[PDB]
Design a protein around this ligand. Structure first.
Ligand SMILES: CC(C)(C)[C@H](NC(=O)C(F)(F)F)C(=O)N1C[C@H]2[C@@H]([C@H]1C(=O)N[C@H](C=N)C[C@@H]1CCNC1=O)C2(C)C
Ligand SMILES: CC(C)(C)[C@H](NC(=O)C(F)(F)F)C(=O)N1C[C@H]2[C@@H]([C@H]1C(=O)N[C@H](C=N)C[C@@H]1CCNC1=O)C2(C)C
Lengths: 297, 299
């Protein structure tokens, strides 16, 4: 049972390089539009305190250098949508997949295609944390890298990368340019709210451990949903809803372990610890696999 | 610090499906040849005790259904090379990348593009274990999925998937059909050997921690490679080779910590434990990041 990303080819064909002045990052080329973080228009000094509408009105189409491979695409128009810039180019991307823009929920997962200078570097799986950060792997020039899910050859873009917080976690926007979380694209110290653990995902992962022959954490006990949520809240876990219980149905039916019985197991894990034992090779409770992730794998 | 697979697009454009009778698996389409596990020619009953030479004699080109999506590629020739079949087709794949076939050593990592019916399903990083198994994630119909590394636009194919052992780990071949480890493509009781920890990768992980400022474990001692190798095996760690010492060269230069000094630091970790302290936020020493993986992620 591995953290598994979606095949990235459909997204690789969409990555381009965007330069304004001496600022360079990645863009996403779909049909005849390139989407990229708006702070590409910023000088270094601008980023410390930008007034984006005022900075953008002072730019011309010819200030935007867009490169796809070695081929320059001419910008023929531009607009700003929240924190994303939409550059109209004079060429349609022939490799545009069927796609949609979606805004995801805390706890959902997605694949990230990390890119530098318009070129793909690596692919990995991420989750939207409850505090709306993501634990990514992003370096200088990675902005404009996107997160996505793939469903029957349709790419659902959900994330575009903008910033790294001092704790090393990452913040970004949906493809309408609205940040996930209370963050904003100004270079100034920003802390995230206290994070919590995605309970439904921990349970899905415990079910994965049982589907793969590991049962040592199970117990003969049971619990009510309300009594479980009291202990979960005490340990900085998110509430478990009845919708969550229903979503875990196929995993419980597959294993014959009632959801509330697995909750009792997690409650004992939380109160007793793991005592140096491991689950699927992990020394800690893993919360970045959704129920759908477990089933698909 | 997390596992990061290579972008998989160059390999996606090479995946096809291969069916013989009712057995369907994946194949790799490069130029005008499709590579796939030879057991595609087996009936389920054949798999229990196959004579591949005799079974291939009773097959002709017209018994092979190669499809790119739902589009058939006409087979014009077939031959067996060790445990892989090579089907010559009448069309050169226009998506063929620059590529090489390489045989990897234990400890080396690679990305796996898991495929079903020729359709890519997911991508993840794997390490070749010292017992020549991989801790993969594969279901029915995954055979013929491949593992690969990429360097500057050249795809190095190193693994093709054939089978799952009773402990849930996986075994396969290089792209010349030669199994890694002492395994055979017969459905018969087989078992992964005892495994060991990939020492060179643990050292790479310690260098990664030092680079990021987590360096409490650096000690004031040193050792010789021979001395270290003899003690390491007492803890089920692999001995180091001359090649291992040299591939740690760049991380050693970057940090200023000599390879043998880091070896002495590891030996102290093995002989006395971590004392509740973590390294890169982990209580366990990670052994599936190569020195290249550490440099790749930081660059
Ligand atoms: C890292 C840092 C101190 C610089 C800063 N962070 C904060 O100011 C915070 F604290 F508010 F978050 C920050 O990210 N930026 C400063 C400036 C842009 C952004 C930025 O450089 N983005 C990079 C895109 N190419 C991706 C970064 C690079 C390092 N790793 C990443 O992921 C903007 C907010 C406009
Ligand atoms: C596991 C079975 C117990 C099924 C068997 N294993 C052993 O016989 C062993 F125990 F010896 F290994 C086994 O794998 N095979 C039997 C037969 C081929 C192979 C096989 O079905 N390959 C699948 C390719 N599509 C991938 C498998 C499917 C499940 N997960 C996988 O990865 C061959 C050796 C010729």
């Amino acid at each position: 049972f591995r953290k598994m990303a979606f095949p990235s080819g459909k997204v690789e064909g969409c990555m381009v390089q965007v330069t304004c002045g001496t600022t360079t990052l990645n863009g996403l080329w779909l049909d005849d539009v390139v989407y990229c973080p708006r702070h590409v228009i910023c000088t270094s000094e601008d980023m410390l305190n930008p007034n984006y509408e005022d900075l953008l009105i002072r730019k011309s189409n010819h200030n935007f250098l867009v490169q796809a491979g070695n081929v320059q695409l001419r910008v023929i128009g531009h607009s700003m949508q929240n924190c994303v810039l939409k550059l109209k180019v004079d060429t349609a991307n022939p490799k545009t997949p069927k796609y949609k823009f979606v805004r995801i929920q805390p706890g959902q997962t997605f694949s990230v295609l990390a890119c530098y200078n318009g070129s793909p570097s690596g692919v990995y799986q991420c989750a939207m944390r409850p505090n709306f950060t993501i634990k990514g792997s992003f370096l200088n020039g990675s902005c404009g890298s996107v997160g996505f899910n793939i469903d029957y050859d349709c790419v659902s873009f959900c994330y575009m990368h903008h910033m790294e917080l001092p704790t090393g976690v990452h913040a970004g926007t949906d493809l309408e340019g609205n940040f996930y979380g209370p963050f904003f694209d100004r270079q100034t110290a920003q802390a995230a709210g206290t994070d919590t653990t995605i309970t439904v995902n921990v349970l899905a992962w415990l079910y994965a451990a049982v589907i793969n022959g590991d049962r040592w954490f199970l117990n003969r006990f049971t619990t009510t949903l309300n009594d479980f949520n009291l202990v979960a809240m005490k340990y900085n876990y998110e509430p478990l809803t009845q919708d969550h219980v229903d979503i875990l149905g196929p995993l419980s039916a597959q294993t014959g372990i009632a959801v509330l019985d697995m909750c009792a197991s997690l409650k004992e894990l939380l109160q007793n610890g793991m005592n140096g034992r491991t689950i699927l090779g992990s020394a800690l409770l893993e919360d970045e696999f959704t129920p759908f992730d477990v089933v698909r794998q």
